Structure 1
Amino acid sequence: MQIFVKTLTGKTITLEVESSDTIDNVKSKIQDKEGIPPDQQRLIFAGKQLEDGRTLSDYNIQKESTLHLVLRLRGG
């Protein structure tokens, strides 16, 4: 299984995962490829924000799925 992560700044990331992997493993992979600590990552798939402790198959994330990595902004 191969998935894609798109950042709010336009960057694209390709991750090699498995359907049985937990969200923690995905966040660790994203940290390895980007340096963002897992506690500061906001991942969205199909309108659901992925939570720690659950597996990819719980969200029905299949191959070639696209996730969004977002963050909150302080201006305004």
Structure 2
Amino acid sequence: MQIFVKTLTGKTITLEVEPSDTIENVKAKIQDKEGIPPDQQRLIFAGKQLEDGRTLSDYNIQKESTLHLVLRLRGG
């Protein structure tokens, strides 16, 4: 499945992953493609933060959906 991750600035990126792929690996894919650290990368879907212990199927994420990519608010 492919999701449309919309960056804070408004730039939408397309990520191709599997439903069985955990959010952590999904983050790693973006970490290698775009080069965004998984710890600073905040993915919010429907007002909920995508936990690494879940999958796309767990959140019942439909295909061609719009996701939001936010950056960390605090460092520590």
The answer as to whether partners of 1:19 and 1:62 remain within 8 angstroms in 2 is no
Count of aligned positions: 76
1:17 and 1:40 mapped to 2: Cα distance? 20
- Following superposition, the deviation at residue 71 of structure 1 comes to 2.0
Matched-pair identity in %: 96
- Following superposition, the deviation at residue 28 of structure 1 comes to 0.8
The answer as to whether partners of 2:40 and 2:72 remain within 8 angstroms in 1 is no
Q: RMSD between aligned alpha carbons?
A: 2.6
The 3 A distance-change label for structure 1 pair 39 and 45 is same
2:75 and 2:42 mapped to 1: Cα distance? 19
Q: Give ranges in structure 2 of 5+ residues lacking alignment.
A: none
What TM-score does the superposition give when structure 1 sets the normalisation length?
0.85
Question: Where does residue 50 of structure 2 map in the other structure?
Answer: 50
Name whichever structure is richer in helix by fraction.
1
Q: Give ranges in structure 1 of 5+ residues lacking alignment.
A: none
